């Protein structure tokens, strides 16, 4: 009845995995209402996101300094976890919504939402990896020369170069999917994790740290 | 009403911290019953712990190979989380219970339990650190020469050396407290964490890995 | 006897330290002529440095992406080791010389050299740490608002902020000394090491890697 | 022109590689005589190696604490670099010689030397990796049950287990070659590097540190 034991143990492991999911759902449910309250207070501080995003340590490593002109117009960010809507979603799946104030003559005021979900390929310990769907955004006027929608050739030496430059901008990240390795915005996956795991949850601590450095 | 906002945010952080604790209690409560069931099956495999303990990668780094003779007689381990009994305990606080089969003429069959709880010293980010109380154990006959209870001098060059050698054995770990840095069993705290965070929860995975290496 | 031995060993360590210096001098002397030859070939490839600097992995982490506009105009870099000129210099001491092509009406074409030398503070094991002297540079026109030489106040909340922003640019690095911890360009020392230990010696390997990726 | 330049740079890299070898030979030649002098003084301190080997931080991670009984009898270690004898040897190639005092009726007093040399497999960047030849050693009497030369079966479940246990002892390391990955003493290569790069060169610093702790 070592047999019975082994069979029993295998089933217990499965129950452990089920428990971890139940625990995570509990956490996400309880946190949802507090995030909504927090977000409401955030809306009362006009320059909040601009400050936080410029303060983060590694965020800046992902995007050309050129983009910051536009990143500075972000005045709202909201993350929502998809597993709260349906149990068919992995606990790590989420949507992220940005609002931009825009810039006269260059960049339209607009709201955009992107969705990220996990998938597995089997083969290798792989807990599974993030994927996303491209989502439309109206690019800044000045980015017309590296806009993939305006470049006619993108197959010529010059066109190919312009194309790759655009895909390396923040706007190229919006059409990231994780399904064409080496052909999309680099590390779109790690950027997404930065948001769900660091930036959205601890933004206030980042803001405080930034306002602290104003004094010394 | 940035003021109101800031005050509101500070309170929300506090609620976050409360939620994390509530989440942890939920996890520990749900897991308790599964651990009891698992443990029951473990009891049916006589050499389980001996195998697991010899299999772990880093456990061996903590104790003289000499001790393994006695570690091999362990036939039962149980961890219990104190926060389940009272909310005055930190979520990380726990008791650990060992049973030894013993060895004829050298080591008595016996059961011992040690308790670990967190404390903070303030000063430094310190999430707080583990502490424990010494607990009595009957040492193996052959360890008489480095037994702190039998060494008369322990202040002479020879006595001091014998004393330090005994405190570096597994049995010296049992009187570890974490309150006399540099004078007790080295890294008693990290060893304790090995048990609560790795060895007890994932013992089955370690056992399987060990039985897997039997084949190649 | 044991005495004699210990004195002998102490002297041998001293001889080891002397040998390490002798070995380093040999390396630097033999390398000097090859660097000069190599540099001559480098001068024939106009966009060399621009490409290499944009290619390095961690260089970008040190400076605002804004600065790259100007970093891209660097068309010459030369490192020389001061220990070759005098034995009073530590083997690690060096001068670094930059030439910038400039940008009409924003940034003047110019050549600048900075010197770095080791010093010790004693106590802490410290092999000793880098120091430098501030060296004058004509800042880009567009950097006028965060130029420490043009800010009148720099003590008001706005002036202090503008001042700190300028000191965090590449140009602020040029007045780094390592003598006012926390008040100068962050990690000026690690940046200097990047140049002497990685960028200058292995630039060609970085360039190749960059040209390798340009098609992919 | 550009052609000429590229050919010139390729040749300069080759010269760099040649220089590194020349520098290394210089270092090894100058150090040889100091090591001989130092070793002579080391021979006058009977318990030197025992203390040093028990003191090293990570050495212990490689071998069963059981082996220390025998490691404690080492009273002499000598490393020599083969590149000093012939230029056909890589700078990293070396021989290592141990002398053991032995233990009456368990372990014979004896001297053993092993040789390590680099080889390349091509493709993977591989600077090339260490290889060695098995060298005969008379095993301790008590290790008879896991001695590969005494196990008759080593193909039965018990024999296979005994065999693998022996190959994981320090004595199994002596027949390591690096030519049968996963079937020989684990990480024999990293252990060899520990000796040539850390233990032999800095033994004195380790000894001092150990004598420093002996009072604390």
Author numbering:
A (entry chain D), B (entry chain D), C (entry chain C), D (entry chain C): 10 to 225
Authors' own words:
While attempting to crystallize Vps75 in complex with histones H3–H4, we inadvertently crystallized Vps75 with four Vps75 monomers in the asymmetric unit. Upon repetition of the asymmetric unit, two distinct tetrameric assemblies of Vps75 are clearly observed in the crystal lattice. One tetramer is made up of two dimers of Vps75, each composed of a copy of chains A and B, which together form an asymmetric ring-like tetramer. The second, symmetrical ring-like tetramer, is composed of a dimer of chain C and a dimer of chain D. Both tetramers are related structures, with the latter most closely resembling the conformation previously observed in solution. In the symmetrical tetramer, the antiparallel dimerization helices of one dimer form a saltire-like cross with those of the opposing dimer (top middle). A ∼30° dislocation in the register of the two dimers allows the symmetrical tetramer to transition into the asymmetrical tetramer (bottom middle) and vice versa. In the symmetrical tetramer the ring-like cavity is open at both sides (top left). However, the transition to the asymmetrical tetramer is also accompanied by a closure of one side of the cavity as the globular domain of one dimer occupies the cavity of the opposing dimer and vice versa (bottom left). Amino-acid conservation analysis shows that residues mapping to the asymmetric and symmetric tetramerization interfaces of Vps75 are well conserved. Thus, in the tetrameric conformation, dimers of Vps75 have a relatively large acidic concave groove between the globular domains of each Vps75 monomer as a result of a straightening of the antiparallel dimerization helices.
